[PDB]
A = this chain, B = another copy of it.
Amino acid sequence: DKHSDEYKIRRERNNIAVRKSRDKAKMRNLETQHKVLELTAENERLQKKVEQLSRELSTLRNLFKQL
């Protein structure tokens, strides 16, 4: 009975749940997009550190090798 009073209230409750479920999903996605930006900045920091330490190690190894 798609005209029933009970029907329309059942539909309304589900419509409310649907908007709630999707807001949550869209928020989660937004939080994830932010996490990527955060992890990217951290990745770049680590890359710079690895490069700096690698060059430091290389120079030191060369010194010893020159004895």
Report Cα–Cα, A53/B32, bound state, in Å.
27
Chain B residues with CB below 8 A from A21, complex form: none
Oligomer copy total: 4
> For the complex, would chain A's binding face be called helix, strand, loop or mixed by DSSP majority?
helix
Kindly identify, within residues 17 to 67 of chain A, every residue whose CB is under 8 Å from any CB belonging to chain B.
19, 29, 32-36, 38-40, 42-43, 46-47, 49-50, 53-64
Known: A43-B43, A53-B57. 15 other contacts (CB 8 A): A12-B59, A16-B55, A19-B58, A34-B38, A35-B39, A39-B40, A39-B43, A42-B43, A46-B46, A46-B47, A50-B50, A53-B54, A53-B56, A56-B57, A57-B57
Residue numbers of A with Cβ under 8 A of B are 11-12, 15-16, 19, 29, 32-36, 38-40, 42-43, 46-47, 49-50, 53-64
